Amino acid sequence: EDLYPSRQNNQPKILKRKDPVIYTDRSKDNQAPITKEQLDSYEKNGFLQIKNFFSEDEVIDMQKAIFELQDSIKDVASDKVIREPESNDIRSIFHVHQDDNYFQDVANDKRILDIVRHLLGSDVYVHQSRINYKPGFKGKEFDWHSDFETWHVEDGMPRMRAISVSIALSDNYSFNGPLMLIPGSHNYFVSCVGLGVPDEESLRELTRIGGGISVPTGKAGSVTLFESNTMHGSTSNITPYPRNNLFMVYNSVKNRLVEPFSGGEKRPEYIAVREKQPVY
Amino acid sequence: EDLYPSRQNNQPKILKRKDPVIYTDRSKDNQAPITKEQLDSYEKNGFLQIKNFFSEDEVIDMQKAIFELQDSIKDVASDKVIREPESNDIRSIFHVHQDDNYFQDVANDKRILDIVRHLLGSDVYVHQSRINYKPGFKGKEFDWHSDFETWHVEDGMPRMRAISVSIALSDNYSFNGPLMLIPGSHNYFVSCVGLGVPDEESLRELTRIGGGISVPTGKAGSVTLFESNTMHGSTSNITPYPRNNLFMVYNSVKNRLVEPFSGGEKRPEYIAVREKQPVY
């Protein structure tokens, strides 16, 4: 049963969300690790920024850890390690939540799990992880998209029951190509043409409904959580201020991947997790 | 005598500014139409934003006027009128300060003249004017540059004694590709390689000296004045919020153009004014 068909024709359409946003009853706000106000802001906007999530030592430790890993894998040949063609410089590393002990501990951090389990109303597992290295002046624009539309079409994610967690590992300014989100857009599924980038008309409609464009900013260490279907994008960075980050996607154990809704072949494990965690 | 050589080799260098910034004595701040604080902010940063420069009716009148002119010239064949190749839609119109009565009155507005004459310490004339039409989702990134470096090399402007005046005719947000400036950068001349875009190393050095990147924002009608040599640029606009503007450059009558410092041919009048205004 495909509740969110996309890329099946050349006519875009906006379909209504058929899933809860916050899956734990609001009568149980007292059990959450965040406030009623934070819960309401997530429900309404489709994302939540939390500043001072980590202590200053934890921030510095994480920043050192990404560059220590980058140096440690300089000679590695792996499809998980994305390199710039000309320099061979490492731009991204996938699947660190599983492959490295330090990043596994970050991915299992109770402060993160307590939130995502509350919001998703179940236990969770990591769908994907990635470290991004984005030096000053690097990283092209990313057109607006819903992660969900890709997870669904290409990876077989059935329902809107996953949350992305972005840890800023550089200071996040308005001017260096920050993540931008359309508030409220998680309530609307944009079918895309027969890739996965919505048309301008749909984007205008979402922006009108949301009242604008949201651009969280903050010091290194700040955390942005965003719902699976929240529309987001970024401009290029023409400034010397980098944009390094650690990205993890938490999916409900009740929403495990099936075959790609496109009818196509599975993507690699490092892109979309199909491991079911063993008893031992 | 070339005080600011550029594009003559392939080694960039930073040369010191050899001209005043504010050409009227600071002992005469009382004669200016702006405050000591505004004067100091211009001197330090190389730009000044003024919100509520125009009354609300004047803002609405100017917005209507750009689109009335755009419609009036739909069938025109002119090198002053810049059109998108595919749609033929009008993206810019040069030389309105001279060619249209309404835009001439804007260019002669006493509120603008009183400021630029104070800052340039002399009478002024308009070097260039342009209306830009930048609908939602349109207008590519503009790499960092100093207008002065172009005016000098290509148009024969001798010294740093011109000011650009940008009137926002759309709301100016942080997220839709606003003008960004490097504060303090007007004090440093970046020679460019043998076009006119400075190298990353120089840009890092300016940004370090300035302490960051400045991005004025404000409602339609807000005015940004910037010194001839202030480094500025913008990202692309991936949002539906337009960026229409009226841009005028005021040059001191003591700094009239000579032959291009490149040794090349003059550009057209609509790009760089060489008319000396007649007595009648």
Author numbering:
A (entry chain A), B (entry chain A): 2 to 195, 211 to 296
Copy the relevant paper text:
Here, we focus on the ectoine hydroxylase, the enzyme that forms (4S,5S)-2-methyl-5-hydroxy-1,4,5,6-tetrahydropyrimidine-4-carboxylic acid from the precursor ectoine through a region-selective and stereospecific hydroxylation reaction. The EctD-mediated hydroxylation of (4S)-ectoine to (4S,5S)-5-hydroxyectoine requires O2 and 2-oxoglutarate as co-substrates, thereby forming CO2, succinate, and 5-hydroxyectoine. The catalytically critical iron is coordinated by the side chains of a conserved H×D/E…H motive, the so-called 2-His-1-carboxylate facial triad.
In addition, the crystal structure of the EctD protein from the salt tolerant moderate halophile V. salexigens in its iron-free form was solved, thereby allowing for the first time an assessment of the structural consequences of the binding of the active-site iron on the overall fold of the ectoine hydroxylase. However, after analyzing the iron content of this strongly overproduced EctD enzyme preparation, it became apparent that most of the isolated proteins did not contain an iron molecule; the iron content of the EctD protein solution dropped to 0.1–0.2 mole iron per 1 mol of EctD, rendering the enzyme largely inactive. Upon addition of Fe2+ ions prior to the enzyme activity measurements, we observed that the activity returned to levels observed before, indicating that the missing iron catalyst in the purified EctD protein can be restored after the protein has adopted its native cupin barrel fold. The cell constants and the space-group were identical to the structure of the iron-bound EctD, suggesting that the apo-EctD protein crystalized in a manner similar to that found in the iron bound form. After solving the new crystal structure of the EctD protein, it became apparent that the iron ligand was lacking, as evidenced by the missing pronounced electron density that is present in the iron-bound EctD crystal structure. Otherwise, the apo- and the iron-bound forms are almost identical, as indicated by the RMSD value of 0.34 Å over 280 Cα atoms. In the V. salexigens EctD protein, the iron ligand is bound via interaction with two histidine side-chains, His-146 and His-248, and the side-chain of Asp-148. Interestingly, in the apo-structure of EctD, two water molecules populate the iron-binding site formed by the 2-His-1-carboxylate facial triad. This keeps the side chains of the His-146, His-248 and Asp-148 in an orientation very similar to that observed in the iron-bound EctD crystal structure. Hence, the EctD apo-protein exists in a form that is pre-set to incorporate the iron catalyst.
